[PDB]
Design an enzyme around this catalytic site. Structure first.
Site, mmCIF file in Angstrom:
data_model
loop_
_atom_site.group_PDB
_atom_site.id
_atom_site.type_symbol
_atom_site.label_atom_id
_atom_site.label_comp_id
_atom_site.label_asym_id
_atom_site.label_seq_id
_atom_site.Cartn_x
_atom_site.Cartn_y
_atom_site.Cartn_z
ATOM 1 N N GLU A 15 58.818 -3.837 -55.046
ATOM 2 C CA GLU A 15 58.012 -4.981 -54.474
ATOM 3 C C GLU A 15 57.892 -6.247 -55.494
ATOM 4 O O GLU A 15 58.856 -6.974 -55.009
ATOM 5 C CB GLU A 15 56.489 -4.471 -54.115
ATOM 6 N N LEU A 45 49.367 20.178 -64.190
ATOM 7 C CA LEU A 45 50.558 20.041 -64.736
ATOM 8 C C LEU A 45 51.169 21.322 -64.729
ATOM 9 O O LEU A 45 50.682 22.483 -65.563
ATOM 10 C CB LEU A 45 50.133 19.687 -66.571
ATOM 11 N N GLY A 93 5.378 -3.336 -75.473
ATOM 12 C CA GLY A 93 4.512 -3.966 -76.242
ATOM 13 C C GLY A 93 3.741 -3.207 -77.488
ATOM 14 O O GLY A 93 2.805 -3.705 -77.821
ATOM 15 N N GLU A 124 17.367 -6.524 -73.329
ATOM 16 C CA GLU A 124 16.202 -7.375 -72.610
ATOM 17 C C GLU A 124 15.741 -8.639 -73.317
ATOM 18 O O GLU A 124 14.993 -9.168 -72.501
ATOM 19 C CB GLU A 124 15.121 -6.319 -72.736
ATOM 20 N N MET A 171 12.017 14.964 -87.415
ATOM 21 C CA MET A 171 12.992 14.551 -88.306
ATOM 22 C C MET A 171 13.658 15.902 -88.774
ATOM 23 O O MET A 171 13.102 16.740 -89.569
ATOM 24 C CB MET A 171 12.164 14.106 -89.539
HETATM 25 N N1 LIG Z 1 2.649 -13.082 -84.634
HETATM 26 C C1 LIG Z 1 2.277 -11.919 -84.219
HETATM 27 N N2 LIG Z 1 1.083 -11.561 -84.365
HETATM 28 C C2 LIG Z 1 0.555 -10.395 -84.166
HETATM 29 N N3 LIG Z 1 1.040 -9.798 -83.284
HETATM 30 C C3 LIG Z 1 2.148 -10.019 -82.847
HETATM 31 C C4 LIG Z 1 2.706 -11.092 -83.045
HETATM 32 N N4 LIG Z 1 4.074 -11.316 -82.355
HETATM 33 C C5 LIG Z 1 3.862 -10.181 -81.457
HETATM 34 N N5 LIG Z 1 3.039 -9.512 -81.832
HETATM 35 C C6 LIG Z 1 2.709 -8.199 -80.974
HETATM 36 O O1 LIG Z 1 4.039 -7.428 -81.203
HETATM 37 C C7 LIG Z 1 4.001 -6.773 -79.604
HETATM 38 C C8 LIG Z 1 5.469 -7.020 -78.972
HETATM 39 O O2 LIG Z 1 6.306 -6.087 -80.056
HETATM 40 P P1 LIG Z 1 7.662 -5.691 -79.610
HETATM 41 O O3 LIG Z 1 8.328 -7.133 -79.096
HETATM 42 O O4 LIG Z 1 8.261 -5.159 -80.768
HETATM 43 O O5 LIG Z 1 7.633 -4.737 -78.284
HETATM 44 P P2 LIG Z 1 8.344 -3.475 -77.750
HETATM 45 O O6 LIG Z 1 7.905 -2.367 -78.139
HETATM 46 O O7 LIG Z 1 9.980 -3.800 -77.934
HETATM 47 O O8 LIG Z 1 8.077 -3.588 -76.127
HETATM 48 P P3 LIG Z 1 8.693 -4.309 -75.037
HETATM 49 O O9 LIG Z 1 10.453 -4.288 -75.386
HETATM 50 O O10 LIG Z 1 8.498 -3.330 -73.772
HETATM 51 O O11 LIG Z 1 8.279 -5.784 -75.038
HETATM 52 C C9 LIG Z 1 3.133 -7.714 -78.729
HETATM 53 O O12 LIG Z 1 2.465 -7.079 -78.015
HETATM 54 C C10 LIG Z 1 2.055 -8.439 -79.647
HETATM 55 O O13 LIG Z 1 0.761 -7.642 -79.712
HETATM 56 MG MG LIG Z 2 11.691 -4.415 -76.552
#
Ligand SMILES: Nc1ncnc2c1ncn2[C@@H]1O[C@H](COP(=O)(O)OP(=O)(O)OP(=O)(O)O)[C@@H](O)[C@H]1O
Ligand SMILES: [Mg+2]
Ligand SMILES: Nc1ncnc2c1ncn2[C@@H]1O[C@H](COP(=O)(O)OP(=O)(O)OP(=O)(O)O)[C@@H](O)[C@H]1O
Ligand SMILES: Nc1ncnc2c1ncn2[C@@H]1O[C@H](COP(=O)(O)OP(=O)(O)OP(=O)(O)O)[C@@H](O)[C@H]1O
Ligand SMILES: Nc1ncnc2c1ncn2[C@@H]1O[C@H](COP(=O)(O)OP(=O)(O)OP(=O)(O)O)[C@@H](O)[C@H]1O
Ligand SMILES: Nc1ncnc2c1ncn2[C@@H]1O[C@H](COP(=O)(O)OP(=O)(O)OP(=O)(O)O)[C@@H](O)[C@H]1O
Ligand SMILES: Nc1ncnc2c1ncn2[C@@H]1O[C@H](COP(=O)(O)OP(=O)(O)OP(=O)(O)O)[C@@H](O)[C@H]1O
Ligand SMILES: [Mg+2]
Ligand SMILES: [Mg+2]
Ligand SMILES: [Mg+2]
Ligand SMILES: [Mg+2]
Ligand SMILES: [Mg+2]
EC number: 2.7.11.1
Lengths: 472, 469, 468
Positions: free
Chosen positions: C60, C196, C262, C289, C429
């Protein structure tokens, strides 16, 4: 301009088709046996003649004209009179117990030309048929022929399967410009009739399946997704029939609201309902109790032991007690009864005892769809609605409803059992109110000959909501 | 690499990695009403109007008059372009009252109009698999020599059956597009796929689209590059105490999630969020899927805020719709559409749990990523509400597991204290900011939410049925 | 049964040496599967890797186009034609036929001294019982000629009959099936050696990817490849976490950071990736994310300058929606990017994101692959996994991939005095001692700070403890 359409005046369809059938073009209406094709065809012609003074030609291929006229007398339509008034021409193309194509297009044109006929219905083109490309070309000839006339056509087609090919041959589908699929889907041991517009060439339409019922007033389609979040909402209060409940709702329920009564079996839902109905008749207003669990007989005995007389309310023509098993029909059928029954009685207050009865067996979506309809119909019609819901569990329930319809209700009354001192108490709570302040207290309450008595909160207890709290 | 011709169909050029390969025929097979014709009309139209590339339309059933009329529906004058000499509708339909013959007509037409594009609709209606491939091969083979990019329409009986009618058309063509119209339980879903493009890359799998007034609009969920702007610009929540609990208020470039049981105060926060925008003469849209314009206007007024005023000032649009009025694809369009006209600074969806009703968690997530993503890249503060299925004892923020897609989470819950249904509000997480970590009690009034003190002397506050210390 | 090396990535593994020498191998598959790409790559590799001349029979596609299509993958077939190492034989009709074809094939084989032949597609020629003998004849002749052939065939259905007429399989000595199966709305390209005759091969199907480098198969079973493992340590970037692990994470190991949304998984990642660049070591960050701007912002608020590390060509950030590609494609993107940067550490944030919408088998396959590649190439992998439940989690992961990780850092909320406090735990660990205490940790503008344990509390694991 955009494709001009011609109103069918079949309840719901003209909203689904965003105006009606594209004028001058043929439209295929295919479905299994007893889906409503003939009826769709009759109703299409009839309404054009009666309403728009648009004459119509019905092209039968097997049904004798006596039977067509005879079946129409069932729906209260008199076709015989429209024959004798020269508005509707039945054109018997059935054989007496080749000429097809060219010969018939002449006959149908001799009739189309004779009556200034703006509408045609051919039922059923399939029965004329031939291999695969034979039906395609012979069909195409007919469509292209009628498009030259400038006439608007309804083409009944047959089906073997319910979700198989659109037509019989896998050709018609494409020949035609507009395609409508009727279905009679067997959902368990019940039948759910739905109409879908698959395509209308050159125009928009509402996509998907829409349920409908063939009543004595013909095809009645409820455009599930063509109701509008466009209803009235006053601050007018109403009484629940319980004084301490009105106090707890910040001066009673709203007139324009859907109220939900949630609790285990025997917690007092039907008592609050009974009461909610007796308040309307006490202020000279009409009410409908939609019972699906108890019979009128039992609903009177139990109401009379609570002090209230349904009889005097019924005889005064202020209370209608309906009563039906949920299994007696499908949801669309029930939704039909309810809408039908509210129009002929024109009440200020609806009550359904209970939604949880109607949710049985039926799928969650199918159920919710029914609830968006009944809730939605009441709301736009300025009718107060009390809906009873029995939770599957009697204690330790974490969700208000198992069907998750809490976001649809405006007000939630919550009955629950409470276990103190080796006994079973009850405890009403106004869980939410959209607009009002409401009491945030879980008040204990008792039932007697007098009705419901709402006493004090469980101030000296923890984990009341659990069902077995602990004295603090 | 193979050279491609831009189609100017929203999403396709990105899915096809630059358009249709030039000098090859592309098969576009689908079931009845799938958008086959529309795709081919557009292909030509968008070709003519943008690059002055003339095109030819061969039609075996539909009259030429009708291809012109149907096109008016999308606000395009095919009649003007026949006269101008840029288009040509070669009528090949039968008369109510040839293989090489047609090719000669099509060949003649191409040179007779200097045409770079063709669309043969549908090469099935012309018709034994042995025979269909030879002639189909001849046609597509002829066109390659002419040196003309081609869109060839073909029909199907089943959404996941054979690609075309005769299990042959596929293998002949260099390029295969499947338009689908899948029944998602009483709701339909339109998807476009590129199954193969010989000699080049593309995107794989099903991409959903809509047929609108502006034609085919495909939303490539997998090409919306997670490459979007960001700042430390702060915007108020509409509640000074909540602003404090977030550490100066919400971030501008962020998705916020308001979660809680039914009637905890989500739709209230949505209200205060929207008003605060109108306070600073900034536009906002309120996507309501559970209430109604009247009931929203009312319930808000009993909270001391005039939506009636904000609408008159054109600083607030309210788009009320039932979730089951359409499929997710359509919603995403409406939402994206209404955002393009009104050009807001803030967006509110009340609620996401309403839209997730009666839908696979996948369709939902993809939709949520969609709206999330759009607002994010368009630098718009998005407040989304979610009703938790469980009113007390909820172990998960959301049952759709979309917490990771959000940046900020305001959690509202019921707390049973001395036989009463008290409420609480806690800024569960805040990416970028500090935020208060306290489950503080709050009451709602005519004035609105009043965020008081934590439950210091209580154990197991989350469970909803706490315990005195 | 001697085998010819295809040099097609991982096919030679699945086939246990390659294709049986002097026999035809059927390669059936639906449209767009990669049959023409397979058969082209079989010859091309045959020439460039062994100087084995090939003959390509086309029924073809015009020879002109087969060349144009190949230019895609970076291969220049025009040069290989002029040089007379490749002969594209055109047997298409005009815009005694089987025998005439054999003769012309037999002509080119003898003329060009050709070891390999590709015929795509034998089906297109024909137009059931009759197909068998004509095919049998075509194969039986090619076995006489002494030519190892690839023979392409087309299919209508994705799991239906192995070939069009339900014969081509039985007549062939070797059967390979390409599939382009639909997983909801995403496609999954799988290759399967069905049989095979006379030899062993890997049973069942194996995913692959059609890339700029052609057919890239992952034999998701014949991996392990020994992999090396040492007691060398690497700082996590958090001083107390380094101690709590017993001197830091092992160099050749899989770290898992599970926790509720968080809780700070992305913070633990951010510092882990910084720590590499503090020691002038390259690290890729695979984000599913958060966008590079947001990752850049939030990091800058925790102290670390992601921008600075990106300029010095130490820190590379990826970013991609899971819903954009399938799992096989994601595995490739990662396997590719590791080779182009050669990082000391990969950080995937999150595995939980990539598990969305996919079957746990399909997902778990993906994890085995990413792990085993990082483990065998001695890239230390930290992986994040947000739990479905924010409090009351009874399982470390909802994907059940805890046995695939060496180390698990478990973050969780703890409800104390009306406030939401977090807690860090080295859950396991393999190889080290690690601390056994659930410690409280705050997050400030400075990063994390791990304070003291909850020794004066019961029911910490539930997230709603009791003071005692
Ligand atoms: N400047 C800051 N001072 C104090 N705490 C903070 C600050 N910036 C972020 N955080 C805290 O860090 C958290 C975010 O942590 P991170 O982004 O690592 O989350 P994670 O465990 O990856 O969760 P996910 O991905 O589901 O959001 C927030 O809930 C907040 O309370
Ligand atoms: Mg995260
Ligand atoms: N007065 C009536 N009240 C209720 N139902 C009715 C009434 N009259 C007719 N029906 C129902 O409505 C249905 C309408 O079907 P219709 O006569 O249109 O057949 P059809 O869909 O054309 O199929 P077929 O090819 O078998 O004629 C009938 O099968 C009948 O059961
Ligand atoms: N005469 C009476 N005196 C006192 N209590 C009564 C009397 N009649 C009924 N009750 C109480 O009312 C209850 C009846 O339940 P009711 O109909 O009020 O609620 P319900 O939740 O709708 O019931 P179900 O779930 O069984 O349909 C009985 O369990 C009983 O405790
Ligand atoms: N103006 C419009 N607005 C919205 N939708 C429209 C509009 N015009 C047409 N459509 C939609 O387009 C569809 C028809 O498109 P098209 O004619 O391209 O279908 P098709 O797949 O070619 O069908 P067939 O090959 O069977 O004729 C209909 O389903 C209709 O809903
Ligand atoms: N005027 C008022 N005075 C006092 N409390 C009020 C007033 N209006 C509303 N409330 C309280 O606040 C609640 C409002 O919650 P909101 O309207 O935000 O609902 P929601 O949390 O979005 O839940 P759902 O989606 O189930 O409606 C009411 O249920 C009531 O308890
Ligand atoms: N450079 C490239 N990068 C990525 N993918 C590519 C590239 N070139 C081709 N592809 C993809 O690989 C496939 C190659 O098509 P190929 O001709 O090998 O398939 P086939 O199954 O033989 O097709 P058919 O049998 O219908 O002729 C196509 O699906 C194409 O999208
Ligand atoms: Mg009939
Ligand atoms: Mg009852
Ligand atoms: Mg068409
Ligand atoms: Mg709300
Ligand atoms: Mg091929």
């Amino acid at each position: 301009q955009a494709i001009a359409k011609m109103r069918t005046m079949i309840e719901g369809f003209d909203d689904i088709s965003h105006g009606g059938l594209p004028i001058g073009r043929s439209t295929l209406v295919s479905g299994t046996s007893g889906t409503g094709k003939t009826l769709f065809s009759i109703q299409f012609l009839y309404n054009g003649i009666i309403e728009f003074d648009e004459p119509g030609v019905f092209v039968t291929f097997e049904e004798t004209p006596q039977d067509i006229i005879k079946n129409a007398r069932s729906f209260g339509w008199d076709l015989a009179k429209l024959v004798d008034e020269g508005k509707l021409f039945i054109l018997d193309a059935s054989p007496d117990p080749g000429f097809d194509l060219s010969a018939l297009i002449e006959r149908i044109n001799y009739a189309i030309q004779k009556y200034r006929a703006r509408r045609v219905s051919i039922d059923s083109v399939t029965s004329v048929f031939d291999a695969s490309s034979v039906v395609r070309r012979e069909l195409f000839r007919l469509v292209a022929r009628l498009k030259q006339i400038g006439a608007t056509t309804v083409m009944t087609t047959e089906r073997i399967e319910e979700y198989g090919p659109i037509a019989r041959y896998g050709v018609e589908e494409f020949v035609s410009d507009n395609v409508v699929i009727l279905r009679n889907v067997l959902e368990g041991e019940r039948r759910r009739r739905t109409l879908e517009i698959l395509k209308l060439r050159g125009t928009s339409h509402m996509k998907g399946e829409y349920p409908f019922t063939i009543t004595d007033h013909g095809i009645n389609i409820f455009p599930l997704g063509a109701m509008r979040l466009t209803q009235r909402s006053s601050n007018v209060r109403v009484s629940s029939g319980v004084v301490r409940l009105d106090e707890m709702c910040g001066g009673g329920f709203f007139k324009d609201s859907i109220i939900l009564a949630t609790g285990a079996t025997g917690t007092g839902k039907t008592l609050l309902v009974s009461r909610f109905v007796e308040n309307a008749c006490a202020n000279k207003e009409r009410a409908i109790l939609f019972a699906y669990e108890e019979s009128r007989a039992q609903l009177l005995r139990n109401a009379y032991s609570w002090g209230m007389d349904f009889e005097e309310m019924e005889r005064q023509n202020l209370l209608k007690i309906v009563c039906a098993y949920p299994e007696s029909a499908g949801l669309e059928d029930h939704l039909q009864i309810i809408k039908s029954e509210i129009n002929d009685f024109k009440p200020a207050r609806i009550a359904i005892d209970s939604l949880s009865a109607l949710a049985r067996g039926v799928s969650n979506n199918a159920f919710r769809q029914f609830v968006i309809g009944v809730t939605g119909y009441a709301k736009q019609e300025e009718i107060t609605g009390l809906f009873t819901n029995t939770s599957d569990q009697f204690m330790g329930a974490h969700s208000i409803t198992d069907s998750h319809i809490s976001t649809i209700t405006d007000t939630i009354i919550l009955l629950q059992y409470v276990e103190i001192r080796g006994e079973m108490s009850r405890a009403i709570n106004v869980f939410k109110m959209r607009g009002s302040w409401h009491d945030k207290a879980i008040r204990e309450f008792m039932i007697s000959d007098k009705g419901p008595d709402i006493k004090d909160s469980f101030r000296n207890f923890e984990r009341i909501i659990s069902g077995s709290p602990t004295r603090i």
